[PDB]
Each structure stands twice: as structure tokens, then as C-alpha cells.
């Protein structure tokens, strides 16, 4: 059985920064360090950090006065940041710079009292945080997930309307939502294409190339990671069996019995050691040396804040 590796796969710049922010806070201040939400949606990263003294919370009312709190890579609403800001908390912000870019646009629209539409998945922490930058009652902030959501939306003033997106969506499905937005609201203003980040776009391009060669695709990533779910979905729509797995123990022998070419990729939040262990298991199941596909080069790094060097 041949094993192919997607390229790029695995950690993006935002995830490497966010994990380093927690690790470095632990090293400088000691345990406990509180983190608002899983720093990234990866069960191995979050358990690793817990075992070193990070405490993951959903609400600020879970954090003691005077504590160090880090916001996760997904970002937080103004209400959350003010709830921390009003309390005693030393805050470090691990929000990805590519989410912060979107938040600055929503904040600009709110200050103008002009309505904004976000494309994104309801209940996702990044959507909470981005919707949560809009505060002006004179405008409005609306969420859409699909063309049908666009077809039913009504707004106060469609001559003064803009759109933003979540960073970890399907490039293809998002393109269809944007086409519906522009047909419904021909004066709508937005980015050239979407706010989907380089890492999401590149891993989807890479898994497409992988799925063109591989009969089965394994995506290393956790169930609650949107970008990792998009990679599995994309291979499945190409007609390949694709499985989202947290680690090598999840691999069922039937999925690769008789398969001549298995492909492996990993979401932006999944560490490379997980992929190495998956490759080791596929080898026990008859695979050979893993062959990385040629891929688009990535060269972006985001540094930790100077406070945490
Ligand atoms: C800022 C982000 O939304 C991406 C963070 C890294 O990936 P992950 O934590 O898996 O988040 P998603 O659920 O958005 O893919
Ligand atoms: S928004 Fe940032 S955290 Fe990663 S998946 Fe994209 S570079």
C-alpha cells in the first residue's frame, strides 16, 4: 500500500503562535494559566497543555480574580474582552492576526452604523467573536451559512452593506454564498473574494490534489475543528472514503484493507507528531515509506508578543 502525504498540511502560523503563547505563559508565570476556550480545536494539544497546568474555561466567570487569562486563536467578542477587562485579569491575546483583521472590519462597519453580514457556522467560537465586534444598534449584524440563508435575509438598508467571512470555511461553498449575496444585494461591499485564510485555502488545494491520487484519505484533526472537517468533506465530495481521526488508534483496519493508495493530511490545529504516529500505524498495516506530494510553499510566521519571549 502506498502512503501519500498532502502538502501543505498541519500547523499554520496562527496555531503555532497561539500554542507558544500558552506554553511561554506557563514557563514565565507557572501554573495555573487560564485559557478562554480550547486554545485550538485539537484534543492532543489541549490535553498536553492541561497536564502542564493550563485550565480551559468557557466563561470568564470561571476565572479567579488576578489570574492570567489567554484568549484562544479563534478570538473573543468585545463583551468577553470587557468582562475580562472589568475584572482583575492579566490578558494575553492568542487570537490569530488573520481573525483580528476581520474583527477590525466589523468594528469599522459598526462605528459607521452600516450593516454587515458574516458568512460562517452558527455556534462556532470565531463567529461568536466576530459577530461580537458589532455593537451599534442603529446598524445590524447578520449571520448566513448558505445561499438559502441569503435568500431569506432582509436588511434595513441594502445600499450600505458589507460582508466578512469566517477564516476556516470551504472555499467552494463560500464562493456560492458570496455569489448569492451579490445577486441579492448588488451594492454589497467586501474583500475581493473572502476572509478565508491562506492556510485554509492551501490545505484545501492540497487535499484536492491528494484525493485525485488516493483511494482513501485520513485527516488528522479533532471533531470540533472546522478547517479539519472541511478537508475530509472535500475528499468525500470527490468520492473518496475520508475519515477525520484524532490519532493512530482511531484507524480501523477495514478502512485500508485492499487499498493500494492511502493519503494523509492534517488540519491547521493538528501537530506533526500525530501524523508521524498515523504513518507508523499505516506502515504496520502494510504501507511503505510515506511520500510527500509537491505543494505550494508556505513561509508565514507570526511571533509571540514581546511580553512572552
Ligand atoms: C482562527 C481559526 O478559526 C483557526 C484556528 C486553528 O484551527 P482550529 O482550532 O481547528 O479552528 P477551526 O474550528 O476554526 O478550524
Ligand atoms: S485564521 Fe489563523 S489560526 Fe490558522 S487556520 Fe488560519 S492561519
Curated annotation (Swiss-Prot):
Disruption phenotype: Cells lacking this gene are viable only if the medium is supplemented with mevalonate or the cells are complemented with an episomal copy of ispH. A conditional E.coli lytB mutant shows that LytB is essential for survival and that depletion of LytB results in cell lysis. Dimethylallyl diphosphate binds at residues 41, 74, 124, 225-227, 269. Was shown to bind 1 [3Fe-4S] cluster per subunit. However, it initially contains a [4Fe-4S] cluster which easily degrades into a [3Fe-4S] form in the presence of oxygen. (2E)-4-hydroxy-3-methylbut-2-enyl diphosphate binds at residues 41, 74, 124, 167, 225-227, 269. It is an enzyme of class 1 (oxidoreductase). One of its GO terms (molecular function) is 4-hydroxy-3-methylbut-2-enyl diphosphate reductase activity. Keywords: 4Fe-4S, Iron, Iron-sulfur, Isoprene biosynthesis, Metal-binding, Oxidoreductase. Changing residue 12 to S: Loss of catalytic activity. It comes from the Bacteria. Optimum pH is 7.0. It holds the Pfam family LYTB. [4Fe-4S] cluster binds at residues 12, 96, 197. Isopentenyl diphosphate binds at residues 41, 74, 124, 225-227, 269. The keyword Metal-binding applies. GO terms for cellular component: cytosol. PANTHER family: 4-HYDROXY-3-METHYLBUT-2-ENYL DIPHOSPHATE REDUCTASE. Catalyzes the conversion of 1-hydroxy-2-methyl-2-(E)-butenyl 4-diphosphate (HMBPP) into a mixture of isopentenyl diphosphate (IPP) and dimethylallyl diphosphate (DMAPP). Acts in the terminal step of the DOXP/MEP pathway for isoprenoid precursor biosynthesis. In vitro, can also hydrate acetylenes to aldehydes and ketones via anti-Markovnikov/Markovnikov addition. Homodimer. Belongs to the IspH family. This is 4-hydroxy-3-methylbut-2-enyl diphosphate reductase.
Amino acid at each position: 500500500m502506498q502512503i501519500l502525504l498532502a502538502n501543505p498540511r498541519g500547523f499554520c502560523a496562527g496555531v503555532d503562535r497561539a500554542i507558544s503563547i500558552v506554553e511561554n505563559a506557563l514557563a514565565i508565570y507557572g501554573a495555573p494559566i487560564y485559557v478562554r476556550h480550547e486554545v485550538v480545536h485539537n484534543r492532543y494539544v489541549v490535553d498536553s497543555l492541561r497536564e502542564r497546568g493550563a485550565i480551559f474555561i468557557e466563561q470568564i466567570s470561571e476565572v479567579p480574580d488576578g489570574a492570567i487569562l489567554i484568549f484562544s486563536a479563534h478570538g473573543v467578542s468585545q463583551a468577553v474582552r470587557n468582562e475580562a477587562k472589568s475584572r482583575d485579569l492579566t490578558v494575553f491575546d492568542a487570537t490569530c492576526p488573520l481573525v483580528t483583521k476581520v474583527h477590525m472590519e466589523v468594528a469599522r462597519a459598526s462605528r459607521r452604523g452600516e450593516e454587515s453580514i458574516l458568512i460562517g457556522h452558527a455556534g462556532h467560537p470565531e463567529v461568536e467573536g466576530t459577530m461580537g465586534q458589532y455593537s451599534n444598534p442603529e446598524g445590524g449584524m447578520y449571520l448566513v451559512e448558505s445561499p438559502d440563508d441569503v435568500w431569506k435575509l432582509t436588511v434595513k438598508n441594502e445600499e450600505k452593506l458589507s460582508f466578512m467571512t469566517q477564516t476556516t470555511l470551504s472555499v467552494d461553498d463560500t464562493s456560492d454564498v458570496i455569489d448569492a449575496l451579490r445577486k441579492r444585494f448588488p451594492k454589497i461591499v467586501g474583500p475581493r473574494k473572502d476572509d478565508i485564510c491562506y492556510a485554509t485555502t492551501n490545505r484545501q488545494e492540497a487535499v484536492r490534489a491528494l484525493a485525485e491520487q488516493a483511494e482513501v484519505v485520513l485527516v488528522v484533526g479533532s471533531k470540533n475543528s472546522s478547517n479539519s472537517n472541511r478537508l475530509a468533506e472535500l475528499a468525500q465530495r470527490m468520492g473518496k472514503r475520508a475519515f477525520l481521526i484524532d490519532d493512530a488508534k482511531d484507524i480501523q483496519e477495514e478502512w485500508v484493507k485492499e487499498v493500494k493508495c492511502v493519503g494523509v493530511t492534517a488540519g491547521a490545529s493538528a501537530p506533526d507528531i500525530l501524523v508521524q504516529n498515523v504513518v507508523a500505524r499505516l506502515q504496520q498495516l502494510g504501507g511503505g515509506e510515506a511520500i510527500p506530494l509537491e505543494g505550494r510553499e508556505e513561509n508565514i510566521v507570526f511571533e509571540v508578543p514581546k511580553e512572552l519571549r
